[PDB]
Design goal:
About 70% of the residues lie in helices and about 0% in strands. The chain is mainly α and about 130 residues long. The protein has a single domain, classed as Histone Acetyltransferase, Chain A (Up-down Bundle). The longest helix has 24 residues. The chain binds the ligand CC(=O)N1C[C@@H]2C[C@H]3c4c[nH]cc4C(=O)[C@]2(C1)N3C.
Length: about 130
């Protein structure tokens, strides 16, 4: 229905606003674009599904996310990729792991404060009907 298409349009407006707020935070600059395969040639042998905040906005605009749950699976993949590629005790690995955990915790905290639980349940019920 047109009312269901209006629901998904509101979901996209909300996800673009959350993603912009993460992308301007100086702590998260390393997660704003794909890892450059020229600069890091073993990256795509270790990490089988690369993800970053520029790819996330592209996916919102392609109508890939029909729930906040499917959006958070990609925020979780940005964080888990950083923990798996950079697992060592040295300061550069520890700094990126700390930033990755802060990106995930910031996204979940914005959604807990600003997403209505009945708006998410409506999106999940339209998705399950398709
Ligand atoms: C997000 C993530 O896991 N990394 C690991 C890469 C290694 C190191 C680097 C050196 N030159 C480009 C680089 C990157 O893009 C990354 C981003 N680092 C900063």
């Amino acid at each position: 229905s047109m009312q269901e298409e209006d629901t998904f349009r509101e979901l996209r407006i909300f996800l673009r606003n959350v993603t912009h707020r993460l992308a301007i935070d100086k702590r998260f600059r390393v997660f704003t674009k794909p890892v450059d395969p020229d600069e890091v040639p073993d990256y795509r042998t270790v990490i089988k599904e690369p993800m970053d905040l520029s790819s996330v906005i592209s996916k919102i605009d392609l109508h890939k996310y029909l729930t906040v749950k499917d959006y958070l699976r990609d925020i979780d993949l940005i964080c888990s990729n950083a923990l798996e590629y950079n697992p060592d005790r040295d300061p550069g690995d520890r700094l990126i792991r700390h930033r990755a955990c802060a990106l995930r915790d910031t996204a979940y905290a914005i959604i807990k404060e600003e997403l209505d639980e009945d708006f998410e349940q409506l999106c999940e019920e339209i998705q399950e009907s398709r």
